[PDB]
Amino acid sequence: DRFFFIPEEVHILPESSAIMVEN
Amino acid sequence: SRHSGILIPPGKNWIYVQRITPTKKKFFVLVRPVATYEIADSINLATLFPKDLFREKDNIQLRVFNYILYGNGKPTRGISDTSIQLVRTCLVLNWVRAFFVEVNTKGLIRDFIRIGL
Amino acid sequence: MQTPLEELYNVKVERKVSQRRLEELGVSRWSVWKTGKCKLPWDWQVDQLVYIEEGEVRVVPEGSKRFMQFLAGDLVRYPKWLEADLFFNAPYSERYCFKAYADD
Amino acid sequence: RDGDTNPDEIRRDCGRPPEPRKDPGSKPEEEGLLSDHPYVDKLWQLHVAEQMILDDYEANPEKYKGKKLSELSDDEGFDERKEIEHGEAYYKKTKLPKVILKTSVKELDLEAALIERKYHNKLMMEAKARGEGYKIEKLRRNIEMDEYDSLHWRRS
Amino acid sequence: PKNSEISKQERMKDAHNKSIVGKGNVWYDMSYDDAIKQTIERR
Amino acid sequence: GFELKPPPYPLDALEPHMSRETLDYHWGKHHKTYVENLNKQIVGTDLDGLSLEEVVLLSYNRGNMLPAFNNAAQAWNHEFFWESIQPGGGGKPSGDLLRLIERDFGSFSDFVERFKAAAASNFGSGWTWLAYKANRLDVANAVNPLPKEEDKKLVIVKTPNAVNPLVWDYSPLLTIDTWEHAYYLDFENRRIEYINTFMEKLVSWETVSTRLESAMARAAQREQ
Ligand SMILES: [Fe+3]
């Protein structure tokens, strides 16, 4: 009688992509 | 503790604590309320049937089936300008033909769904 | 056939029943069953007296191609085990008395 | 004889036994009582016809001008001997059967239905003016169905 | 038998159901009369 | 192991309505035999310990009567019959019993004539009963959500042999024994005279009223 939902924006990108945000 | 993720129930939302270590000698804490979404165990299907005074025994029977569209831990994907359904409550017909019922009056037309045995 | 359905199926008809028999049976203190244009498939697993004051009913026994015509003011006793089909073409209302063995 | 079309009438004209059939095996007093009055289906059809007429009247009120609602007339061709006609229709690439339930206006209590709807619409407007919603538990025709079912259950 | 009439109907309903719900798990089942009962108390 | 109790009135106190010879033979030769046969049957069975009402309802078995039904039902009906007759009986009831008799029968004369007709028309051995309609059936959809307080009324029923209203979950209130052994030594086949004498000299309205109140209490305790 209880469920949960964590909001996490998951992105999958190729190895040839360019990442504008640091880890 | 060293556990990666610790969930703390509320003393209004469940508090989930996860430990992330960017480096070996550094770590921090993240706190996020998750959903606290409770489904109505019953839907007032008295937009379904008028709840007549007398109801006979029927071989057919309807049940309110609680469904969960996404599995435990399975990711949910949502496209822009389109929401995500997470429950999708369903009714199960257990015990059958089906045909339209159309009543008309001076050209006024309305169809009904008849599900009988 | 030659024999009318009432004799074949043993249905008592007391058309234009006098007030004396009505007050003897206590019809005025019976319940009222109402119906409009409908069709009731019923099997009389018990005797039943019926008095019709308003409405008309055409009774068709199971398999019969003929009917027994009952008007208002008639006292009818439907026998046990009768498998008929009740038909109504107008608003209808009747007084009843289900009867067990012996009794009346 | 040629007039003998029912075996039961034949076997009752003489003294012959009834035609046997398989024993159902279910006792007649252990079965549950029946409370579905056969007239409710006609009541349901009349109820939905009245509701659709009221909704059309609210949608397009100008038609019913200069004529009393109680003095409505049927179209030239409305037959009372073909009140149910079987048919078939296509829906989502499926030829699901459809039954057309013909209905006149003489057998409908239009004034009572209109007054009852105005009671709801007036109270819905009051609820709307109060920033609230009102849901009707049941209408007059539903009460009629309930009382007819009470009569049938009393019979049972 | 996989070509039996019941098997044809059995798989047809699963395809009918799968397009409705999908791969999710049945949380629980409740009677219809229970749906009539509980929410009336709530409202 | 049941026992036979004596009637609560002297055997010579019912004259001229019921002769002492008839009373003693009916009690110690019919009721005694029924009770002793029932006790013989119930030796070592499951029936031991249960009250007589439970005995009758168990032995009825929803129609396919067990062999012990006859003796137990006859004993219960005879116990009921003795409690319904007193030397100072007859006349008319009063209070809620009379208002219920008026509601269900119009007038007292109507009720007594209907009861006499039923007692006379009971073909063969049997009983005629007046009972309170507080029955519940063993089927679902047998509950009325809107009781009108009239469905629990007083009705007249006739039963053959040892049948009693409690099998239909009814509450017996008054009985007259239409078995010929009850009155043959006194009235022979003059059943109408016996019924008239019973109604006008032996009907104990106090016991009937107490049973009506007990039936009301049972209905009330079943309400909640
Ligand atoms: Fe006796």
Question: What residues does C47 pair with on adjacent strands?
Answer: C99
Q: Whole-angstrom Cα distance, residue D89 to residue D84?
A: 16
CB pairs under 8 A between C and D: 50
Structure tokens at F137: 């059936």
Pairing of strands D97-101, B26-33: unpaired
Chain B residues whose beta carbon lies within 8 Å of the beta carbon of residue F140? 57
Given its phi and psi angles, is residue D131 left (phi above 0), alpha (psi -120 to 50 degrees) or beta?
left
Residue of B nearest to D99 (CA): B101
- Number of residues assigned to chain D: 156
Query: Residue D112: helix, strand or coil by DSSP?
Result: helix
- Cα–Cα distances (Å) from D71 to D22, D64, D106, F102, F220, in that order, read 56, 11, 9, 50, 54
DSSP state of C28: G
**Burial of F74 per CB tally in 10 Å (0-12, 13-18, 19+):** buried
Of all residues in chain B, the one with the smallest CA distance to A5 is: B35
Q: How far is F141 from chain D (nearest CA, A)?
A: 6
Query: Residue A6 and residue B14: Cβ atoms within 8 Å?
Result: no
Contact E20 B65 (CB under 8 A): no
Nearest to D103 among B100, B105, B112 (CB): B105
Residue indicated by tokens 């009432």: C6
Comparing alpha-carbon positions, the chain B residue that sits nearest to A23 is B22
Cα distance between residue D34 and residue D30, in whole Å: 12
* Maximal CA-CA distance, chain C: 39
Q: How far is F60 from chain C (nearest CA, A)?
A: 19
* D30·F139 Cβ contact <8 A: yes
User: Which three-class secondary structure string do you get for B20-50?
Assistant: EEEECCEEEEEEEECCCECCCCCCCCCCCCC
Helix ranges (H only) for F42-83 are 52-60, 69-83
Cα(F192) to centroid(ligand 1), Å? 17
Distance between B56 CA and the closest CA of chain F, angstroms: 6
Using alpha carbons only, what angle is made at residue C70 by residues C69 and C73, rounded to the nearest 5 degrees? 155
Maximum alpha-carbon separation in chain B: 83
Q: Which long-range contacts (CB under 8 A, 24 or more apart) does B24-31 make?
A: none
How many beta carbons lie within 10 A of that of residue F116, not counting itself?
18
Contact of chains E and C by CB distance (3 or more pairs under 8 angstroms): no
> For residue B54, what are the contacts with CB-CB under 8 A and spacing of at least 6?
D35, D36, D146, D149, D150, D152, D153, F141, F145
F195 contacts F177 by C-beta, under 8 angstroms: no
CB contact under 8 A, D100 and B104: yes
Residue F35 CA, ligand 1 centroid: distance in Å: 12
- Taking contacts as CB-CB distances below 8 angstroms, the residues of chain F near D35 are 141
The CB density around residue C47, as the number of other CB atoms within 10 Å, is 19
Token code pair at residue B44: 């007032």
Q: For chain D, what is the total number of helices (H) and then of strands (E)? A: 4, 2
Residue E28 to residue B44, Cβ atoms within 8 A:
no
Question: What six digits make up the tokens of F77?
Answer: 């009906």
Residue with tokens 């008295």: B46
- In this structure, how many other beta carbons lie within 10 angstroms of the beta carbon of residue C50? 19
Nearest to C43 by CA among C57, C68, C62, C28: C62
- Bridge-based pairing of strands C57-61 and C82-88 is antiparallel
Q: Does E21 sit within 8 Å of B88, measured CB to CB? A: yes
Q: Residue F119 Cα, ligand 1 centroid: separation in angstroms?
A: 14
Residues of chain F with Cβ-Cβ distance to B53 below 8 Å are: 145-146
- Largest Cα span, chain E: 51
CA dihedral D103, D104, D110, D114 (to 10 degrees): 50
Strands C68-70 and C57-61, sheet pairing: antiparallel
Whole-number Å distance between alpha carbons of F55 and F65: 12
In this complex, the residue of D30, D35, D150 whose CB is nearest that of residue F141 is D35
Q: How many of the other CB atoms lie within 10 Å of CB of B62?
A: 19
Name the experimental technique: cryo-EM
Task: Lay out the sheet containing C47-54: strands in order across.
Answer: C12-13, C75-78, C47-54, C92-99, C32-35
Q: Report the alpha-carbon distance of residue F223 to residue F147 in Å, rounded.
A: 11
CA atoms lying within 13 Å on the CB side of residue F13: 12
Q: What share of chain C is helix, strand, coil (3-state, %, to 5)?
A: 15, 45, 40
Query: Do chains C and B touch by CB distance (3+ pairs < 8 Å)?
Result: no
Chain B residues in contact with E34 by the CB 8 A cut-off are 41-42, 64
Q: Does C37 touch chain D (CB under 8 A)?
A: yes
Report the amino acid identity of residue F82.
W
* C-alpha pair distances (Å), D47 with each of C30, D14, D50, D109, D150: 30, 49, 5, 10, 19
**Min Cα–Cα distance to chain B from F141, Å:** 6
Give the closest of D4, D148, D155 to C1, CB-based.
D4
- Tell if the CB–CB gap between C65 and D6 is shorter than 8 Å: yes
Amino acid at C21: R
One-letter amino acid at F80 equals: F
Angle at Cα F189 formed by Cα F10 and Cα F199, nearest 5°?
50
How far is Cα C102 from Cα C100, in angstroms, rounded to an integer? 6
Q: Residue B5 CB: number of other CB atoms within 10 A?
A: 10
* Furthest C-alpha separation in chain D: 78
Say if CB F186 and CB F98 are below 8 A apart.
no
* Resolution as reported, in Å: 2.6
In the reported structure, the alpha carbon of residue F79 is separated from the centroid of ligand 1 by a whole-number distance in angstroms of 10
Taking the centre of ligand 1 as the mean of its atom positions, its distance from the CA of residue F129, in whole angstroms, is 13
CA distances from F221 to D18, F214, F215, F217 (A): 48, 10, 10, 6
CA–CA separation, F214 vs F224, rounded Å? 16
Q: Please state, in angstroms and rounded to a whole number, the distance separating the CA atoms of residues C57 and F208.
A: 44
Strands C75-78 and E25-31: unpaired
Helix (H) or strand (E) holding F216: helix F205-223
Q: Considering only CA atoms, which of F123, F130, F132, F131 is closest in space to residue F178?
A: F123
Nearest to B63 among E20, E25, E30 (CB): E30
Both tokens of residue C62?
């199971």
Q: DSSP strand E in chain D: where?
A: 84-88, 97-101
E strand map for F66-223: 126-132, 154-160, 171-177
Strand order in the sheet with E25-31: B90-94, B61-68, E25-31
Which residues 6+ apart lie within 8 Å of D139 measured at CB?
A: D47, D116
Asked whether C95 and C30 are in contact (CB, 8 A), the reply is yes
Q: Is C7 exposed, middle or buried (0-12, 13-18, 19+ CB in 10 A)?
A: exposed
Q: Could A5 and B76 be called an inter-chain contact, meaning their C-beta atoms sit closer than 8 Å?
A: yes
Q: Where are the beta strands (DSSP E) in F26-119?
A: none
Contact C1 D42 (CB under 8 A): no
Rg (CA), chain E: 17
Instruction: Enter the DSSP assignment of B77.
Output: -
State which amino acid sits at residue A14. P
Buried b (16+ CB within 10 A) or exposed e, B73-86: eeeeeeeeeeeeeb
CA atoms B11, B12, B13, B19: torsion sign: negative
Q: Which two tokens stand for residue D38?
A: 């056969």
Query: Residue D98: which residues within 8 A CB-CB, separation 6 or more?
Result: B99, B100, B101, B102, B111, D87, D88, D89
Helices (H) and strands (E) in chain B, counts: 0, 7
CA separation for the pair D20, F36 (Å, rounded): 46
Kindly tell me the sign of the dihedral angle through the C-alpha atoms of F134, F135, F139, F141.
negative
